Amino acid sequence: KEEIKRLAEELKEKTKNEEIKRLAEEAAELAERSDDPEVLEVVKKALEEALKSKNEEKIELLLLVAVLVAEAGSVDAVEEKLEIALLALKLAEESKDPRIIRGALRAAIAALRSDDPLALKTVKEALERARASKDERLIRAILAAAYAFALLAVAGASAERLKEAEAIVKELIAAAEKGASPQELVLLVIEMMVKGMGVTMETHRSGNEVKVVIKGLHESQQEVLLEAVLFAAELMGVRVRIRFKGDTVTIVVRE
Amino acid sequence: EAVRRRFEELLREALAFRERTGGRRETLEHAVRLARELAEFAASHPEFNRQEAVLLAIELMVRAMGVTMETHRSGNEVKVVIKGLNIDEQVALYRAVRETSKIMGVETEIEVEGDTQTIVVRE
What we know:
The complex is a heterodimer.
Chain A: H1 5-14, H2 19-33, H3 37-52, H4 56-70, H5 79-93, H6 98-113, H7 117-132, H8 136-155, H9 159-177, H10 182-196, E1 201-206, E2 209-215, H11 219-236, E3 239-245, E4 248-254
Antiparallel strand pairs in A: 1-2, 2-4, 3-4
Helix pairs in contact in A: 1-2, 1-3, 2-3, 2-4, 3-4, 4-5, 4-6, 5-6, 5-7, 6-7, 6-8, 7-8, 7-9, 8-9, 8-10, 8-11, 9-10, 10-11
Chain B: H1 2-20, H2 26-43, H3 50-65, E1 68-74, E2 77-83, H4 87-104, E3 108-113, E4 116-121
Antiparallel strand pairs in B: 1-2, 2-4, 3-4
């Protein structure tokens, strides 16, 4: 059938990104090899969407959709992965809050880049519950905890530690729907990263601010905590003050 | 002084990559590689001071991202206050400061709050 390559090559010259240039070629190579009428329909569609978008995340998540469909050969094998992006991409057209659009896309991309079944399972469930509610503070809270739980799977936590973190994701959504403050919703993401990475913490509640002390984090792990705490704190509108010193991370959470 | 000529060369490569890609995350992960590529060149120069080597890694990332900085020197402590960073830039800045300091072998006390990241370089 062809006609896919020229759509994928036009994205390569249009974009300035390097990952877009690499995945677009990778999609044109893998789709040419597959012969499924359902797959060449998705790949062709995903490319036409990326050509219209000015968003490097929207283009990246659409490309990573055509790649993971053509490389899988069939559409039934990536039926969940497809809905994970299809929900996150849906959650971008409707919502107008830049926090939600950037959050929902990075959360899907991190989950699709990971392979953990418990990670993709948690993300689809989280995006179903986010797309349902019309509450903005809940959608911004589900995405904070989802993207933080995806970065644990990208960093490669153990099977029994992601389990502990998954229960925390479940407690965060439950507390967000019951109306917990954005401060405590941040402290549940810190606890997810603490439990997720197998450390402990102390909680000082003095006045209107919370102090958390974490010890035993390798520099590769402090980078994941900082990214997860800064991103979730931005989705809640909450001031954080993180101070590093060796293996000790100190977090000061203000509203 | 040959470390300085390697610095100026990596700085052209850092500013040029800021124009070509213009992506809020591809330039960062690239520029961090350049900051560590500078730390590697100065790690095998026993003449070069280990603090000033990290400072040039910091100054390399500051211009790669487009923010400003102020150098406060107090004996053996050099405090660098960097202002105007978002989330992607601070995660990219902290990675570059963690690895270049690990390579030079200096302790760094980094404090992040809002859009400002404060780095202390002892030895």
